[PDB]
Amino acid sequence: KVFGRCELAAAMKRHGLDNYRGYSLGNWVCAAKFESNFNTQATNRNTDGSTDYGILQINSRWWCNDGRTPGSRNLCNIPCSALLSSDITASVNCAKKIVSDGNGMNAWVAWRNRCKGTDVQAWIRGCRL
Numbered sequence: 400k401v402f403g404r405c406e407l408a409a410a411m412k413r414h415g416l417d418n419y420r421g422y423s424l425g426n427w428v429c430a431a432k433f434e435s436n437f438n439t440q441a442t443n444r445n446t447d448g449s450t451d452y453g454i455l456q457i458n459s460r461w462w463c464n465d466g467r468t469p470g471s472r473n474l475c476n477i478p479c480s481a482l483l484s485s486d487i488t489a490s491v492n493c494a495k496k497i498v499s500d501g502n503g504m505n506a507w508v509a510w511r512n513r514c515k516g517t518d519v520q521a522w523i524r525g526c527r528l
């Protein structure tokens with residue numbers, strides 16, 4: 400599924416991401432825009448043989464099991480394919496674990512390089528929340 404901007408903002412707010420660990424909603428919407436262009440089915444093969452999955456491009460090296468990243472962890476205890484669903488629950492629940500692990504949203508390279516330090520509230524302007 401390819402989300403609209405305000406559609407995704409409302410879904411993320413319902414799932415408790417607004418101000419989660421101090422990150423306002425616009426941060427999460429900005430991260431999803433540049434990680435996946437709002438597409439739940441996005442996948443990208445990393446260098447090291449791991450793969451990033453879903454709307455927030457969660458990495459199989461640490462966070463999910465895809466059966467083809469030897470020596471990796473599965474800290475969210477999920478198959479990586481669950482992160483491609485039109486229902487974003489699994490992605491949100493795993494993202495909450497990632498952002499809590501000490502490095503905040505710097506875990507997402509596109510957030511660090513394209514959202515951090517910008518007016519991220521622009522990403523939820525005009526939406527019904």
Ligand SMILES: [Cl-]
Pocket residue numbers: 423424425426519520521523
């Ligand atoms: Cl915001």
Ligand SMILES: [Cl-]
Pocket residue numbers: 420421502503504
């Ligand atoms: Cl933080």
Ligand code: NA
Pocket residue numbers: 459460461462463464465468471472473
């Ligand atoms: Na894994």
